[PDB]
Amino acid sequence: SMEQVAMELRLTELTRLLRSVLDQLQDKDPARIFAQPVSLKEVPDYLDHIKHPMDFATMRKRLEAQGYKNLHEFEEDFDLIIDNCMKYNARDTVFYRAAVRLRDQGGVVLRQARREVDSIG
């Protein structure tokens, strides 16, 4: 159908908006602490602590499969990256502090993306 295509054009445009948002959030992690999954070879107990691991490369694979239906699903994944870090790592660590700064700095990008998604539809 002609509708399904119109749907697909918006999903594609959402993917286009979300890609730009992902790049902006990831620029806020210049140390690349959140770029890749936590290694199960290097932290073999990690899944005993964190049940839903997430990282920027994993979010990107989902994004490029147009696996995000709306901004809310995308935000859930971003929030996992932060909250998992803040649980696994103690307060006085470079990792925890990196997550606090990503959360704070990402807030502004996410604020505007929500207006853009409502606005453009």
PDB file of C-alpha atoms in Angstrom:
ATOM      1  CA  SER A   1       0.000   0.000   0.000  1.00  0.00           C
ATOM      2  CA  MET A   2       0.640   3.687  -0.401  1.00  0.00           C
ATOM      3  CA  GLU A   3       0.016   4.143   3.352  1.00  0.00           C
ATOM      4  CA  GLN A   4       2.748   1.557   4.363  1.00  0.00           C
ATOM      5  CA  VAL A   5       5.267   3.510   2.231  1.00  0.00           C
ATOM      6  CA  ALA A   6       4.255   6.878   3.925  1.00  0.00           C
ATOM      7  CA  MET A   7       4.736   5.096   7.312  1.00  0.00           C
ATOM      8  CA  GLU A   8       8.144   3.865   6.083  1.00  0.00           C
ATOM      9  CA  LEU A   9       9.146   7.420   4.931  1.00  0.00           C
ATOM     10  CA  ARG A  10       8.459   8.761   8.527  1.00  0.00           C
ATOM     11  CA  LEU A  11      10.238   5.755  10.191  1.00  0.00           C
ATOM     12  CA  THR A  12      13.151   6.594   7.872  1.00  0.00           C
ATOM     13  CA  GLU A  13      13.007  10.227   8.794  1.00  0.00           C
ATOM     14  CA  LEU A  14      12.807   9.277  12.513  1.00  0.00           C
ATOM     15  CA  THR A  15      15.880   7.096  11.965  1.00  0.00           C
ATOM     16  CA  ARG A  16      17.462  10.115  10.288  1.00  0.00           C
ATOM     17  CA  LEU A  17      16.679  12.370  13.302  1.00  0.00           C
ATOM     18  CA  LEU A  18      17.705   9.690  15.833  1.00  0.00           C
ATOM     19  CA  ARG A  19      21.041   9.131  14.031  1.00  0.00           C
ATOM     20  CA  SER A  20      21.911  12.794  14.432  1.00  0.00           C
ATOM     21  CA  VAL A  21      20.824  12.637  18.151  1.00  0.00           C
ATOM     22  CA  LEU A  22      22.997   9.513  18.651  1.00  0.00           C
ATOM     23  CA  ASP A  23      26.055  11.324  17.201  1.00  0.00           C
ATOM     24  CA  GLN A  24      25.466  14.297  19.465  1.00  0.00           C
ATOM     25  CA  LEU A  25      25.138  12.059  22.592  1.00  0.00           C
ATOM     26  CA  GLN A  26      28.214  10.096  21.691  1.00  0.00           C
ATOM     27  CA  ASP A  27      30.276  13.340  21.232  1.00  0.00           C
ATOM     28  CA  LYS A  28      29.554  13.861  24.923  1.00  0.00           C
ATOM     29  CA  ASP A  29      31.663  10.713  25.676  1.00  0.00           C
ATOM     30  CA  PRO A  30      35.084  11.732  24.313  1.00  0.00           C
ATOM     31  CA  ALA A  31      36.788   9.105  26.438  1.00  0.00           C
ATOM     32  CA  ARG A  32      34.691   6.395  24.631  1.00  0.00           C
ATOM     33  CA  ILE A  33      33.799   4.775  27.911  1.00  0.00           C
ATOM     34  CA  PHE A  34      30.328   3.871  26.500  1.00  0.00           C
ATOM     35  CA  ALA A  35      31.285   3.160  22.854  1.00  0.00           C
ATOM     36  CA  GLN A  36      31.262  -0.620  23.038  1.00  0.00           C
ATOM     37  CA  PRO A  37      29.775  -3.371  25.200  1.00  0.00           C
ATOM     38  CA  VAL A  38      31.361  -4.140  28.539  1.00  0.00           C
ATOM     39  CA  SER A  39      33.674  -7.135  27.673  1.00  0.00           C
ATOM     40  CA  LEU A  40      32.521 -10.431  29.248  1.00  0.00           C
ATOM     41  CA  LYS A  41      36.087 -11.720  28.794  1.00  0.00           C
ATOM     42  CA  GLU A  42      37.351  -8.759  30.967  1.00  0.00           C
ATOM     43  CA  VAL A  43      34.359  -8.543  33.393  1.00  0.00           C
ATOM     44  CA  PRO A  44      33.167 -12.168  33.488  1.00  0.00           C
ATOM     45  CA  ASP A  45      30.674 -11.540  36.343  1.00  0.00           C
ATOM     46  CA  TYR A  46      29.017  -8.562  34.607  1.00  0.00           C
ATOM     47  CA  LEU A  47      25.679 -10.281  33.833  1.00  0.00           C
ATOM     48  CA  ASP A  48      25.321 -11.242  37.531  1.00  0.00           C
ATOM     49  CA  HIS A  49      25.130  -7.453  38.127  1.00  0.00           C
ATOM     50  CA  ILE A  50      23.609  -5.911  35.024  1.00  0.00           C
ATOM     51  CA  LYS A  51      20.678  -7.681  33.333  1.00  0.00           C
ATOM     52  CA  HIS A  52      20.255  -5.460  30.312  1.00  0.00           C
ATOM     53  CA  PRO A  53      23.682  -4.223  29.067  1.00  0.00           C
ATOM     54  CA  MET A  54      23.732  -1.397  26.543  1.00  0.00           C
ATOM     55  CA  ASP A  55      26.320   0.762  24.764  1.00  0.00           C
ATOM     56  CA  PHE A  56      26.501   3.124  21.812  1.00  0.00           C
ATOM     57  CA  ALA A  57      27.581   0.532  19.157  1.00  0.00           C
ATOM     58  CA  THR A  58      24.590  -1.710  20.129  1.00  0.00           C
ATOM     59  CA  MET A  59      22.209   1.286  19.910  1.00  0.00           C
ATOM     60  CA  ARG A  60      23.628   2.059  16.489  1.00  0.00           C
ATOM     61  CA  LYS A  61      23.015  -1.483  15.177  1.00  0.00           C
ATOM     62  CA  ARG A  62      19.389  -1.231  16.374  1.00  0.00           C
ATOM     63  CA  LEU A  63      19.051   2.264  14.852  1.00  0.00           C
ATOM     64  CA  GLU A  64      20.359   1.203  11.409  1.00  0.00           C
ATOM     65  CA  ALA A  65      17.912  -1.701  11.405  1.00  0.00           C
ATOM     66  CA  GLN A  66      15.152   0.985  11.992  1.00  0.00           C
ATOM     67  CA  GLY A  67      14.539  -0.855  15.205  1.00  0.00           C
ATOM     68  CA  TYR A  68      13.522   2.295  17.144  1.00  0.00           C
ATOM     69  CA  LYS A  69       9.718   2.939  16.762  1.00  0.00           C
ATOM     70  CA  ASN A  70       9.703   6.260  18.666  1.00  0.00           C
ATOM     71  CA  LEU A  71      12.077   8.530  20.663  1.00  0.00           C
ATOM     72  CA  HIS A  72      10.896   6.918  23.948  1.00  0.00           C
ATOM     73  CA  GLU A  73      12.443   3.509  23.022  1.00  0.00           C
ATOM     74  CA  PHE A  74      15.706   5.278  22.063  1.00  0.00           C
ATOM     75  CA  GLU A  75      15.772   7.116  25.371  1.00  0.00           C
ATOM     76  CA  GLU A  76      15.231   3.901  27.296  1.00  0.00           C
ATOM     77  CA  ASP A  77      18.456   2.547  25.693  1.00  0.00           C
ATOM     78  CA  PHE A  78      20.382   5.729  26.472  1.00  0.00           C
ATOM     79  CA  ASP A  79      19.245   5.658  30.023  1.00  0.00           C
ATOM     80  CA  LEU A  80      20.420   1.983  30.347  1.00  0.00           C
ATOM     81  CA  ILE A  81      23.907   2.976  29.346  1.00  0.00           C
ATOM     82  CA  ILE A  82      23.907   5.541  32.189  1.00  0.00           C
ATOM     83  CA  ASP A  83      22.039   3.643  34.880  1.00  0.00           C
ATOM     84  CA  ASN A  84      23.981   0.388  34.370  1.00  0.00           C
ATOM     85  CA  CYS A  85      27.253   2.320  34.804  1.00  0.00           C
ATOM     86  CA  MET A  86      26.056   4.099  37.880  1.00  0.00           C
ATOM     87  CA  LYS A  87      25.118   0.762  39.509  1.00  0.00           C
ATOM     88  CA  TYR A  88      28.154  -1.309  38.566  1.00  0.00           C
ATOM     89  CA  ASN A  89      30.743   1.366  39.304  1.00  0.00           C
ATOM     90  CA  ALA A  90      31.203   3.225  42.562  1.00  0.00           C
ATOM     91  CA  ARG A  91      30.711   6.961  42.938  1.00  0.00           C
ATOM     92  CA  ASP A  92      34.414   7.835  43.144  1.00  0.00           C
ATOM     93  CA  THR A  93      35.358   6.192  39.799  1.00  0.00           C
ATOM     94  CA  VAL A  94      36.106   7.674  36.425  1.00  0.00           C
ATOM     95  CA  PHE A  95      33.344   5.512  34.903  1.00  0.00           C
ATOM     96  CA  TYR A  96      30.525   6.711  37.275  1.00  0.00           C
ATOM     97  CA  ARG A  97      31.635  10.305  36.794  1.00  0.00           C
ATOM     98  CA  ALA A  98      31.643   9.824  33.026  1.00  0.00           C
ATOM     99  CA  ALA A  99      28.014   8.676  33.192  1.00  0.00           C
ATOM    100  CA  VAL A 100      26.927  11.623  35.326  1.00  0.00           C
ATOM    101  CA  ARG A 101      28.457  14.032  32.747  1.00  0.00           C
ATOM    102  CA  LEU A 102      26.837  12.151  29.829  1.00  0.00           C
ATOM    103  CA  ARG A 103      23.459  12.290  31.548  1.00  0.00           C
ATOM    104  CA  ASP A 104      23.773  16.011  32.309  1.00  0.00           C
ATOM    105  CA  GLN A 105      25.079  16.977  28.846  1.00  0.00           C
ATOM    106  CA  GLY A 106      22.727  14.634  26.993  1.00  0.00           C
ATOM    107  CA  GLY A 107      19.680  16.230  28.711  1.00  0.00           C
ATOM    108  CA  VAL A 108      19.852  19.276  26.432  1.00  0.00           C
ATOM    109  CA  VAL A 109      20.046  17.203  23.209  1.00  0.00           C
ATOM    110  CA  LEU A 110      17.126  15.005  24.307  1.00  0.00           C
ATOM    111  CA  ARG A 111      15.038  18.025  25.301  1.00  0.00           C
ATOM    112  CA  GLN A 112      15.288  19.469  21.805  1.00  0.00           C
ATOM    113  CA  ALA A 113      14.853  16.108  20.013  1.00  0.00           C
ATOM    114  CA  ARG A 114      11.519  15.657  21.836  1.00  0.00           C
ATOM    115  CA  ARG A 115      10.320  19.076  20.572  1.00  0.00           C
ATOM    116  CA  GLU A 116      11.558  18.154  17.004  1.00  0.00           C
ATOM    117  CA  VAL A 117       9.742  14.782  17.049  1.00  0.00           C
ATOM    118  CA  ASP A 118       6.428  16.283  18.273  1.00  0.00           C
ATOM    119  CA  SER A 119       6.846  19.288  15.900  1.00  0.00           C
ATOM    120  CA  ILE A 120       7.723  17.347  12.664  1.00  0.00           C
ATOM    121  CA  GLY A 121       5.286  14.548  13.762  1.00  0.00           C
TER     122      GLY A 121
END
